[PDB]
Amino acid sequence: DQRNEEKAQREANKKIEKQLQKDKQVYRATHRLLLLGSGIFETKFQVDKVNFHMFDVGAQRDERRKWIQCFNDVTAIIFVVANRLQAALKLFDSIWNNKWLRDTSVILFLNKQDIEDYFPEFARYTTPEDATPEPGEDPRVTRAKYFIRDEFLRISTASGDGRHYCYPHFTNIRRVFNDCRDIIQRMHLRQYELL
Amino acid sequence: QVQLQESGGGLVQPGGSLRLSCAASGFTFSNYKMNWVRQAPGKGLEWVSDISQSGASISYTGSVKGRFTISRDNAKNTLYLQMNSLKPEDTAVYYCARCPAPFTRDCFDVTSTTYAYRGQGTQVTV
Amino acid sequence: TASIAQARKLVEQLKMEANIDRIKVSKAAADLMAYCEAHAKEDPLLTPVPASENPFR
Amino acid sequence: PEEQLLFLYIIYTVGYALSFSALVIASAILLGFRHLHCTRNYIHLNLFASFILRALSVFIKDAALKWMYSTAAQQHQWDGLLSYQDSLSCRLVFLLMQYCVAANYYWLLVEGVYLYTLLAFSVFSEQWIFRLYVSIGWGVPLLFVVPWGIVKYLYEDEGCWTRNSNMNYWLIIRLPILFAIGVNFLIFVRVICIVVSKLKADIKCRLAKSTLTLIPLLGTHEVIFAFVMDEHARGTLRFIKLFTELSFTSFQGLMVAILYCFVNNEVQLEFRKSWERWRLE
Amino acid sequence: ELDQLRQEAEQLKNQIRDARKACADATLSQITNNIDPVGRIQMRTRRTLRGHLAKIYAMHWGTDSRLLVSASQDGKLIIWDSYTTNKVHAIPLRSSWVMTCAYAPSGNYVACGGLDNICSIYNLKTREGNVRVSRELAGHTGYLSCCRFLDDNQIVTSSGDTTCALWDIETGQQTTTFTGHTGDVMSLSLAPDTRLFVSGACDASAKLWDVREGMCRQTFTGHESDINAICFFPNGNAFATGSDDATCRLFDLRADQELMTYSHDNIICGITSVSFSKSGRLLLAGYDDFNCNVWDALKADRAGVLAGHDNRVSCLGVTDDGMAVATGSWDSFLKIWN
Ligand SMILES: CC[C@@H](c1ccccc1)N1Cc2cc3c(cc2C[C@H]1C(=O)N[C@@H](Cc1ccc(-c2ccnc(C)c2C)cc1)C(=O)O)OC[C@H](c1ccc(OCc2ccc(Cl)c(Cl)c2)cc1)O3
């Protein structure tokens, strides 16, 4: 009549916020990652008892200016870079410069080996001696994967200041765990204004 | 209505020149980053060039750099592409695609699916 | 050959978009001006509602 | 002598005046704005509320000294002061005062171990870990002040304010306090090695900000002034040995208010966006 | 070649264009210049519902104007009580990526969909207490961008594969597909009779569909960028959009042209949500600079700002009695304004 609908309404409300507190302790404990190169492919994995979530988009179109805004809350955008490499620079240039993806860090993985055609500046390019490989695969391969690394770092070190960071790697689940640790740590130093 | 009628094109000798215009309609030309996008016969769409909303930031793909130049005239609402020293690898259908939103630096406009703010194209052969 | 088939379905649409008959703007704008003034006495975001009957006070 | 040591007492009194003034403006900014209700501004608010009651202790003792000068000099009555000294007034006020200085060294500690568990551990539930930090901060000081007042009423209660040379009972206030200074340095040299690891990815002009920011928040200047300001480890031919270590402890509530409320950018945009909500009106 | 009918589509486009120029005898601003204005709309946030963990992409009111559902990207579908600030239900979703939500006009169901390409119907009024999924409506390619119930059995859903679809919940299959958009359909809005609905898409175009015939009736191209939001006038004879070119536009079903543009020089951020008031005199547009400018829908001038949000306003809804505006945003708070 006057409490039979009301103080029992605030009882079913407080049985909700007890489950919303367990759902908050598990939401802040998981790390959401977007992995891009039904309509979503959620992939759970755990490295050293820290649970990660990786979402590969499946049945979606190649128009992505509208669903990429869903993934600004994620920890790190994993960007796997397999002509088709210039299209990966222009995609990474869009992720880096999007107004909503300005606070979202990009882990960046690289695959291919074997160009001077699609990049004529590559022929006038020698590898930095300050960054070397250990096992020594080829002198001619490490001058190429350090070129396309510095193509994707020409985007990241162009007016993208200390709010999102690019982590380029050569190819793996341990490397995402060590980069998501650096993303969370650099966020906690920006909250105390130490970075 | 966003309409983009790109002109120019045709056949050319290897080493020749062209001047592809692109008359823009239905939007303020000054607010948008504009691109040039081509599609080779048997290939997908690759991005060629780019120019910022003032003409300041200008980009090219690696295979056209030095030979091609891009230009816009915000007073006459026309986007240009001068294609000097042409090659047999440069024959494609050249589209005048613009970025979807004004005042932005991110563009998503080389899509096999229907991107809305590009033109029907002009054919360039050698 | 969907290049000619999609542009066929694009041009039957502009045919059925054509054969409709449009009224003038001055007649249609006077019917949106008349809906607002005939319902302005029941717009609680327009008229400042007194605080006893506003249920969110 | 007096021309300089009065200039130190004025700094200690006025340094706690500008601190405690700035620790209410910083505790009304961080508590008034609902958007600034993090689980770290709660640690700041309970630390600013600990620098305040430390500053109220200074006001009390200073006020008492002023009362002795102006009133007890020429009126020539000491019954009130004598009755208060040997009464359960003096002991109670002293214990509360010594809690007000020991709940400061433990709220610069759970402000330090909270930042370390953001950067190192990061696997926890923030529902219960906050209710721990308001229990290590306010309740763990009660475990070595009340056993210190229990032993005070039982042994050596001949005067509430004074003591003797006996320091086998002063292992209850000084030793749990200097443990908390000995941990806020180990967190200081672990957060600093993290920050230089984030800069191994012009840092000499950049580490000079993130080190001087971390010094008032953790209370690291007690360790710095105990190692480089020795100077025979006595009072010898100096003025600025004792001057800095009473200026960098009085103005510390001012510096945790400036560096962690006012020049904070996510607080400054709570004034740069709640003003255009009033500029339209 | 295809130019035997390509230029037929432009020469049809010319004769539609001046057929609207033969119909624009005046403008809406010339008709409504002597209309004395609204004044200064000053809405205070009465409520602030605080229970979501991530960005709220959509809310929807109930027809009783008291309950509302709101979807967030944490995987929640919290049904609120706006009068009491009590969460009635809090539905956990199988997909965290949920970009839309709807409430049944009867009040028995809620729908939600997102990047799992699936609309999920939840029976609130079951005999078990626990709210469970009534149906999954999986026939859409691409993300689901909007959904609006027709009754307890029919729901129209727009999606990311550039098509809208009319469903049948008891069968699960879609009765009608609405094709014609070239960019992905971002929002829809039903007519008050629910025999028509408009749909804005990322081709800077808004189409008017017959629900039972299944065809497109009229197409409205007046914007410049991706239309994120659409809303009918309360009369049902006009509608208002909002796109990424920072302009709202009042279109018109009968004159087949835009009547008015709602612009400002200080506004260079896209509209994410539009709604009308109960009479249609106000047009409340949610923006990306985090506030919600109230527009006089007849005079085109701004009558107020709903500035209380800390991140991007993603949704906006006016009640069915016109007494509240519930705007959610990307900070996880819905605010009821008045
Ligand atoms: C830096 C020196 C300065 C100071 C100033 C700012 C902050 C801190 C420290 N300081 C001042 C001081 C004041 C004293 C004192 C010494 C010094 C020296 C000295 C000091 O550094 N001192 C040690 C050591 C120390 C520690 C604690 C106390 C203490 C304990 C309990 N209560 C009080 C008020 C005090 C001051 C005293 C000395 C310490 O700082 O720790 O001797 C007792 C006397 C008193 C008088 C009257 C009284 O009754 C009140 C009353 C009386 C009649 C009426 Cl009618 C009414 Cl209404 C009210 C009570 C005390 O005030």
mmCIF file of all heavy atoms in Angstrom, chain A residues 1 5-6 23-25 27-28 33 64 77-78 83-84 116 119 164 170 188:
data_model
loop_
_atom_site.group_PDB
_atom_site.id
_atom_site.type_symbol
_atom_site.label_atom_id
_atom_site.label_comp_id
_atom_site.label_asym_id
_atom_site.label_seq_id
_atom_site.Cartn_x
_atom_site.Cartn_y
_atom_site.Cartn_z
ATOM 1 N N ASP A 1 0.817 -1.200 0.000
ATOM 2 C CA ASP A 1 0.000 0.000 0.000
ATOM 3 C C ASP A 1 0.863 1.267 0.000
ATOM 4 O O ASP A 1 0.712 2.124 -0.871
ATOM 5 C CB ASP A 1 -0.987 -0.033 1.186
ATOM 6 C CG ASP A 1 -0.313 -0.297 2.531
ATOM 7 O OD1 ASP A 1 0.924 -0.474 2.567
ATOM 8 O OD2 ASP A 1 -1.022 -0.336 3.556
ATOM 9 N N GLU A 5 5.058 -1.880 -1.615
ATOM 10 C CA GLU A 5 5.627 -1.717 -2.941
ATOM 11 C C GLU A 5 6.946 -0.962 -2.933
ATOM 12 O O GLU A 5 7.604 -0.900 -3.974
ATOM 13 C CB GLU A 5 4.644 -0.967 -3.848
ATOM 14 C CG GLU A 5 4.556 0.526 -3.544
ATOM 15 C CD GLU A 5 3.543 0.873 -2.464
ATOM 16 O OE1 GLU A 5 3.029 -0.047 -1.797
ATOM 17 O OE2 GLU A 5 3.279 2.078 -2.268
ATOM 18 N N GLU A 6 7.345 -0.377 -1.803
ATOM 19 C CA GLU A 6 8.486 0.529 -1.780
ATOM 20 C C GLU A 6 9.669 0.006 -0.981
ATOM 21 O O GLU A 6 10.787 -0.015 -1.499
ATOM 22 C CB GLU A 6 8.072 1.904 -1.244
ATOM 23 C CG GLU A 6 9.244 2.862 -1.065
ATOM 24 C CD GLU A 6 10.100 3.006 -2.318
ATOM 25 O OE1 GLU A 6 9.535 3.211 -3.412
ATOM 26 O OE2 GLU A 6 11.340 2.914 -2.205
ATOM 27 N N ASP A 23 30.363 -7.979 -9.777
ATOM 28 C CA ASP A 23 30.574 -7.765 -11.202
ATOM 29 C C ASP A 23 31.497 -6.585 -11.452
ATOM 30 O O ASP A 23 32.039 -6.444 -12.550
ATOM 31 C CB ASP A 23 29.240 -7.553 -11.904
ATOM 32 C CG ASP A 23 28.444 -8.830 -12.028
ATOM 33 O OD1 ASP A 23 28.930 -9.879 -11.553
ATOM 34 O OD2 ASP A 23 27.332 -8.785 -12.595
ATOM 35 N N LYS A 24 31.680 -5.721 -10.456
ATOM 36 C CA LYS A 24 32.665 -4.657 -10.585
ATOM 37 C C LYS A 24 34.061 -5.147 -10.244
ATOM 38 O O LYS A 24 35.034 -4.686 -10.840
ATOM 39 C CB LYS A 24 32.293 -3.479 -9.694
ATOM 40 C CG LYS A 24 33.083 -2.228 -9.976
ATOM 41 C CD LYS A 24 33.040 -1.277 -8.810
ATOM 42 C CE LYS A 24 31.653 -0.702 -8.625
ATOM 43 N NZ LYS A 24 31.618 0.327 -7.550
ATOM 44 N N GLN A 25 34.187 -6.087 -9.305
ATOM 45 C CA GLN A 25 35.508 -6.598 -8.954
ATOM 46 C C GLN A 25 36.077 -7.463 -10.067
ATOM 47 O O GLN A 25 37.294 -7.648 -10.156
ATOM 48 C CB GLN A 25 35.456 -7.401 -7.651
ATOM 49 C CG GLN A 25 35.083 -6.641 -6.368
ATOM 50 C CD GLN A 25 35.507 -5.185 -6.355
ATOM 51 O OE1 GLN A 25 36.696 -4.869 -6.373
ATOM 52 N NE2 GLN A 25 34.532 -4.288 -6.296
ATOM 53 N N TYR A 27 35.157 -6.833 -13.370
ATOM 54 C CA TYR A 27 35.294 -5.983 -14.545
ATOM 55 C C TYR A 27 36.614 -5.227 -14.522
ATOM 56 O O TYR A 27 37.261 -5.069 -15.563
ATOM 57 C CB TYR A 27 34.117 -5.014 -14.631
ATOM 58 C CG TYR A 27 34.178 -4.062 -15.796
ATOM 59 C CD1 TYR A 27 33.869 -4.482 -17.077
ATOM 60 C CD2 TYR A 27 34.538 -2.740 -15.612
ATOM 61 C CE1 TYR A 27 33.926 -3.616 -18.136
ATOM 62 C CE2 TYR A 27 34.599 -1.871 -16.664
ATOM 63 C CZ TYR A 27 34.292 -2.313 -17.921
ATOM 64 O OH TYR A 27 34.354 -1.439 -18.975
ATOM 65 N N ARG A 28 37.030 -4.748 -13.350
ATOM 66 C CA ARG A 28 38.314 -4.075 -13.219
ATOM 67 C C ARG A 28 39.491 -5.037 -13.183
ATOM 68 O O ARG A 28 40.633 -4.595 -13.333
ATOM 69 C CB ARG A 28 38.353 -3.216 -11.957
ATOM 70 C CG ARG A 28 37.125 -2.385 -11.706
ATOM 71 C CD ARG A 28 36.863 -1.384 -12.790
ATOM 72 N NE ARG A 28 35.562 -0.759 -12.593
ATOM 73 C CZ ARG A 28 35.057 0.177 -13.383
ATOM 74 N NH1 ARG A 28 35.743 0.603 -14.432
ATOM 75 N NH2 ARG A 28 33.862 0.686 -13.122
ATOM 76 N N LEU A 33 41.132 -6.462 -24.729
ATOM 77 C CA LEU A 33 42.006 -6.138 -25.843
ATOM 78 C C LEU A 33 41.210 -6.255 -27.126
ATOM 79 O O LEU A 33 40.408 -7.178 -27.273
ATOM 80 C CB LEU A 33 43.203 -7.072 -25.904
ATOM 81 C CG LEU A 33 43.984 -7.254 -24.619
ATOM 82 C CD1 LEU A 33 44.768 -8.531 -24.676
ATOM 83 C CD2 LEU A 33 44.878 -6.085 -24.457
ATOM 84 N N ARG A 64 34.751 0.709 -40.848
ATOM 85 C CA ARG A 64 34.977 0.562 -39.417
ATOM 86 C C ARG A 64 35.028 1.881 -38.669
ATOM 87 O O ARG A 64 35.579 1.928 -37.579
ATOM 88 C CB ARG A 64 36.267 -0.202 -39.155
ATOM 89 C CG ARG A 64 37.483 0.400 -39.770
ATOM 90 C CD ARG A 64 38.691 -0.376 -39.347
ATOM 91 N NE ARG A 64 38.405 -1.799 -39.335
ATOM 92 C CZ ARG A 64 38.588 -2.598 -40.376
ATOM 93 N NH1 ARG A 64 39.064 -2.108 -41.508
ATOM 94 N NH2 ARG A 64 38.295 -3.884 -40.283
ATOM 95 N N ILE A 77 45.014 -1.938 -27.992
ATOM 96 C CA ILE A 77 44.542 -2.371 -29.296
ATOM 97 C C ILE A 77 45.674 -3.162 -29.932
ATOM 98 O O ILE A 77 46.706 -2.600 -30.293
ATOM 99 C CB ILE A 77 44.132 -1.174 -30.159
ATOM 100 C CG1 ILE A 77 42.858 -0.553 -29.621
ATOM 101 C CG2 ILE A 77 43.880 -1.581 -31.556
ATOM 102 C CD1 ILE A 77 42.456 0.711 -30.337
ATOM 103 N N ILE A 78 45.516 -4.472 -30.034
ATOM 104 C CA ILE A 78 46.524 -5.278 -30.707
ATOM 105 C C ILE A 78 46.326 -5.119 -32.204
ATOM 106 O O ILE A 78 45.242 -5.377 -32.727
ATOM 107 C CB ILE A 78 46.438 -6.748 -30.291
ATOM 108 C CG1 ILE A 78 46.525 -6.874 -28.778
ATOM 109 C CG2 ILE A 78 47.544 -7.526 -30.943
ATOM 110 C CD1 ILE A 78 46.221 -8.244 -28.295
ATOM 111 N N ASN A 83 51.414 -1.591 -50.612
ATOM 112 C CA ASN A 83 50.141 -2.218 -50.933
ATOM 113 C C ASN A 83 49.381 -2.542 -49.660
ATOM 114 O O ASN A 83 48.689 -1.690 -49.117
ATOM 115 C CB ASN A 83 50.349 -3.486 -51.762
ATOM 116 C CG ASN A 83 49.071 -3.963 -52.427
ATOM 117 O OD1 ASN A 83 48.194 -3.164 -52.756
ATOM 118 N ND2 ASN A 83 48.959 -5.273 -52.629
ATOM 119 N N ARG A 84 49.508 -3.778 -49.180
ATOM 120 C CA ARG A 84 48.789 -4.174 -47.980
ATOM 121 C C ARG A 84 49.492 -3.726 -46.707
ATOM 122 O O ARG A 84 48.876 -3.749 -45.638
ATOM 123 C CB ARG A 84 48.573 -5.691 -47.971
ATOM 124 C CG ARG A 84 49.660 -6.455 -47.271
ATOM 125 C CD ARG A 84 49.491 -7.951 -47.354
ATOM 126 N NE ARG A 84 50.639 -8.610 -46.743
ATOM 127 C CZ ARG A 84 51.793 -8.832 -47.365
ATOM 128 N NH1 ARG A 84 51.959 -8.466 -48.629
ATOM 129 N NH2 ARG A 84 52.782 -9.434 -46.724
ATOM 130 N N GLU A 116 61.385 -2.316 -51.876
ATOM 131 C CA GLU A 116 61.870 -1.089 -52.490
ATOM 132 C C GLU A 116 60.931 -0.552 -53.558
ATOM 133 O O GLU A 116 61.134 0.570 -54.032
ATOM 134 C CB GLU A 116 63.259 -1.312 -53.089
ATOM 135 C CG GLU A 116 63.263 -2.047 -54.420
ATOM 136 C CD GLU A 116 63.058 -3.541 -54.270
ATOM 137 O OE1 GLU A 116 63.503 -4.099 -53.246
ATOM 138 O OE2 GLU A 116 62.446 -4.154 -55.169
ATOM 139 N N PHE A 119 58.103 1.281 -51.354
ATOM 140 C CA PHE A 119 58.818 2.226 -50.501
ATOM 141 C C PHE A 119 60.163 2.495 -51.152
ATOM 142 O O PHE A 119 61.136 1.765 -50.929
ATOM 143 C CB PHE A 119 58.992 1.683 -49.085
ATOM 144 C CG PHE A 119 57.713 1.567 -48.328
ATOM 145 C CD1 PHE A 119 57.007 0.379 -48.322
ATOM 146 C CD2 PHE A 119 57.209 2.649 -47.629
ATOM 147 C CE1 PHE A 119 55.816 0.268 -47.631
ATOM 148 C CE2 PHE A 119 56.019 2.548 -46.932
ATOM 149 C CZ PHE A 119 55.322 1.355 -46.932
ATOM 150 N N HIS A 164 48.761 7.775 -24.995
ATOM 151 C CA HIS A 164 48.686 6.448 -25.576
ATOM 152 C C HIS A 164 50.032 6.159 -26.208
ATOM 153 O O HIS A 164 50.704 7.072 -26.691
ATOM 154 C CB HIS A 164 47.529 6.339 -26.575
ATOM 155 C CG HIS A 164 47.626 7.261 -27.749
ATOM 156 N ND1 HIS A 164 47.544 8.628 -27.629
ATOM 157 C CD2 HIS A 164 47.657 7.009 -29.073
ATOM 158 C CE1 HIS A 164 47.610 9.185 -28.822
ATOM 159 N NE2 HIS A 164 47.678 8.222 -29.717
ATOM 160 N N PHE A 170 58.340 -7.780 -33.154
ATOM 161 C CA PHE A 170 58.562 -8.637 -34.313
ATOM 162 C C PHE A 170 58.212 -10.068 -33.944
ATOM 163 O O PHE A 170 58.679 -10.578 -32.920
ATOM 164 C CB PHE A 170 60.014 -8.591 -34.794
ATOM 165 C CG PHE A 170 60.584 -7.213 -34.915
ATOM 166 C CD1 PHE A 170 61.683 -6.839 -34.163
ATOM 167 C CD2 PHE A 170 60.040 -6.304 -35.795
ATOM 168 C CE1 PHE A 170 62.217 -5.581 -34.276
ATOM 169 C CE2 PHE A 170 60.568 -5.042 -35.912
ATOM 170 C CZ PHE A 170 61.662 -4.683 -35.153
ATOM 171 N N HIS A 188 48.850 4.911 -14.033
ATOM 172 C CA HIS A 188 48.873 5.201 -12.607
ATOM 173 C C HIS A 188 49.941 6.220 -12.250
ATOM 174 O O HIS A 188 49.894 6.804 -11.167
ATOM 175 C CB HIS A 188 49.092 3.920 -11.827
ATOM 176 C CG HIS A 188 47.915 3.007 -11.837
ATOM 177 N ND1 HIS A 188 48.037 1.637 -11.791
ATOM 178 C CD2 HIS A 188 46.590 3.266 -11.879
ATOM 179 C CE1 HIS A 188 46.836 1.091 -11.804
ATOM 180 N NE2 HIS A 188 45.941 2.058 -11.857
#
